[PDB]
Design a protein around this ligand. Structure first.
Ligand SMILES: *[C@@H]1O[C@H](CO)[C@@H](O)[C@H](O)[C@H]1NC(C)=O
Ligand SMILES: [Ca+2]
Ligand SMILES: [Ca+2]
Ligand SMILES: [Ca+2]
Lengths: 306, 298, 65
């Protein structure tokens, strides 16, 4: 009316600033996407000359002389064809077969079921002008292969992560197994020890009761945004633990940690940044809490020798 | 400065025109984004690939159709698992399985028994890498049920000059016999039969002390030489040592090829030498050792 | 509430929604662009400034009141 009618004008001026501001940020983004689309008319490339020494997996290779950490070819079993993998031969006596690796966000992890089944990403890359690929790329080996390796015999799992401030903690599991596809790659872990927090077996430290329990991954089934096999038993298509862009993991209701989450730059991220407000992203609540995305995350396995 | 309260209806109806417009563009953008995500699921293209064609050895494969050098998977009849190798296929259609390679010194050859048994170094589609296939593999290949094999030794100096030494009925034994090297006879070659021995003049037994036919393989951690001391160790390598050598392809890689006695705290002649061709103080610039069924060697 | 004073209440929420939506699109595009690094010849080097979005939000929550 009298003075309240003064808000209206100052108000129009505000929104006017925003709506015309955003309309520009959009222009910016559009420009940005068109550029990247052009850079994608051609791919990135690698030249990974294969090492001579080979074996069923990294442990056998290091016992056969392979002492350098790089890409190796392994034939777990004679039925299946040999495949490339990265071997960590330095970390804790080496002989670690890397099955999962995050470090820079170069690879997409929010994929469907089939790709998590076959594997995806870049295993290795060429190091400072060298004919062999000595550094690991970001990748998921593939459920089938992981299931086969862990079953070959007693297998232990080493999970490593780093925050955006340089800190590092580890998660060790003396026993680790992943069943085959018919069993929805059901996971089983045990004999923990570390500094990262036993998120897989216990659940989120920040939670209490049935909540700290429904975040337990041990014994869970594997799910991808296009294949629900989680702990949420309902018909509400809005409660599933893995939504579009989200990664495949051993979700319950829903998680304590998710090494396969979206790679948020910087670390801290909020609900209004996440595609669904849900908190996807390389999480491990037991150490950095709920809305923090690691800078480095990796999963390594090694035959367990008492 | 706050205008007419009558413009508000158009002004208000204006922010809406640029609001829905914004939402519109955002939708197309998201579509554009969907398309981008599609062009970013693939992995970097690896130049180095392996052919599918397999066989008992490079020849078996070459015959099957393969026509270009490159990495392949072979499985000799008696082998447990199959293993990758570097096949060389010429125009005449001869599949040479290479098991030793030198060309830059990037790969250290001062390795132990196991490593020399299992193999070390890297395989490359363009045969531009150094390696040792592995005594066990070489053994398997050269002792396939009733198949005489032939070993060709190719050298090259720091002047673009090459030479070759061929050996008929090449064979390498099993670990039980320390991968003993053996052959029927020097099948010729301008490189020279360095395996038969070489007279230096240091001793009256030189020839005897430097012959390689029949010699077992040695590494510092597994002395099998004909010397009261350790050949493989002194030279710092793995090889069929006698006392010690006349032909030694797994030697230290001396850049320039020319080295002397003042090259070590003992004056050892531990380089890539082959007495019949150049002097013992000349380490080759390149070295390749390949085999192929004798019944094919012209 | 008069007609006009009611058409504004609508927008205020609308923009607040479109702001959040854009803030999200921004992060989504950043993540996806970076994930092209492992597939395409190169990746558009960039850096999002959530700050401007963080300011326009409050700057709007205040004027709504
Ligand atoms: C479990 O979650 C519900 C809803 O967020 C909450 O009310 C309850 O307190 C939680 N349980 C805990 C940790 O007390
Ligand atoms: Ca995807
Ligand atoms: Ca469900
Ligand atoms: Ca001796």
């Amino acid at each position: 009316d009298e003075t309240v009618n003064s808000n209206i004008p100052t108000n129009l001026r505000v929104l006017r600033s925003i709506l015309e501001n955003l309309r520009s940020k959009i222009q910016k983004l559009e420009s940005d996407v068109s550029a990247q689309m052009e850079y994608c008319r051609t791919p990135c490339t690698v030249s990974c000359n294969i090492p001579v020494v080979s074996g069923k997996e990294c442990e056998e290779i290091i016992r056969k002389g392979g002492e350098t950490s790089e890409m190796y070819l392994i034939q777990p079993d004679s039925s299946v064809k040999p495949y490339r993998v990265y071997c960590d031969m330095n970390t804790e006596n080496g002989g670690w077969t890397v099955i999962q690796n995050r470090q820079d966000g170069s690879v997409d992890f929010g994929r469907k079921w089939d790709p998590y089944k076959q594997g995806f990403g870049n295993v290795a890359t060429n190091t400072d002008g060298k004919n062999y690929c000595g550094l690991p790329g970001e990748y998921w080996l593939g459920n089938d292969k992981i299931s086969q390796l862990t079953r070959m015999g007693p297998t232990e799992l080493l999970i490593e992560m780093e925050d955006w401030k340089g800190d590092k903690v580890k998660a060790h599991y003396g026993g680790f197994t992943v069943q085959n596809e018919a069993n929805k790659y059901q996971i089983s872990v045990n004999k923990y020890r570390g500094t990262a927090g036993n998120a897989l077996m216990d659940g989120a430290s920040q939670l209490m009761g049935e909540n700290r329990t429904m975040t337990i991954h041990n014994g869970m089934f594997f799910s991808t945004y296009d294949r629900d096999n989680d702990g949420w038993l309902t018909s509400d298509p809005r409660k599933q633990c893995s939504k579009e862009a989200g990664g495949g993991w051993w979700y319950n209701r829903c998680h304590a940690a998710n090494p396969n989450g979206r790679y948020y730059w910087g670390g801290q991220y909020t609900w209004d940044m996440a595609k669904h407000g849900t908190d996807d992203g390389v999480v491990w609540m037991n150490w950095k809490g709920s809305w923090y995305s690691m800078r480095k995350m990796s999963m390594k396995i090694r035959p367990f020798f008492p | 400065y706050e205008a007419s309260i009558l413009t508000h209806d158009s002004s208000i109806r204006y922010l809406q025109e640029i609001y829905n417009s914004n939402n519109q563009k955002i939708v197309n953008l998201k579509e554009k984004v969907a398309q981008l995500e599609a062009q970013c699921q693939e992995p970097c293209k690896d130049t180095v690939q392996i052919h599918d064609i397999t066989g008992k050895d490079c020849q078996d494969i070459a015959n099957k159709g393969a026509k270009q050098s490159g990495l392949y998977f072979i499985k000799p009849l008696k082998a447990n698992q199959q293993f990758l190798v570097y096949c060389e296929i010429d125009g005449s259609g001869n599949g040479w399985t290479v098991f030793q390679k030198r060309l830059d010194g990037s790969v250290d050859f001062k390795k132990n028994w196991i490593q020399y048994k299992e193999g070390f170094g890297h395989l490359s589609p363009t045969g531009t890498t150094e390696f040792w296939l592995g005594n066990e593999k070489i053994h398997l290949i050269s002792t396939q049920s009733a198949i005489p094999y032939a070993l060709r030794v190719e050298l090259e100096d720091w002047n673009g000059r090459t030479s070759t030494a061929d050996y008929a009925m090449f064979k390498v034994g099993p670990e039980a016999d320390k991968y003993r090297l053996t052959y029927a006879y020097f099948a010729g070659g301008d490189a020279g039969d360095a395996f038969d021995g070489f007279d230096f003049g240091d001793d009256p037994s030189d020839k005897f002390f430097t012959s390689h036919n029949g010699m077992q393989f040695s590494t510092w951690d597994n002395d099998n030489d004909k010397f009261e001391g350790n050949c493989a160790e002194q030279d710092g390598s793995g090889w069929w040592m006698n006392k010690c050598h006349a032909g030694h392809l797994n030697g230290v890689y001396y850049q320039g090829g020319t080295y002397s006695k003042a090259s070590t705290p003992n004056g050892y002649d531990n380089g890539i030498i082959w007495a019949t061709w150049k002097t013992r103080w000349y380490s080759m610039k390149k070295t390749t050792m390949k085999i192929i069924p004798f019944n094919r060697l012209t | 509430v008069i007609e006009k004073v009611q058409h504004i209440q609508l927008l205020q929420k609308n923009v607040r929604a479109q702001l959040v939506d854009m803030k999200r699109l921004e992060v989504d595009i950043d993540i996806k662009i970076r994930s092209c690094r492992g597939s395409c010849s190169r990746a558009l080097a960039r850096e999002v400034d959530l700050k401007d979005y963080e300011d326009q939000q409050k700057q709007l929550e205040q004027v709504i009141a």
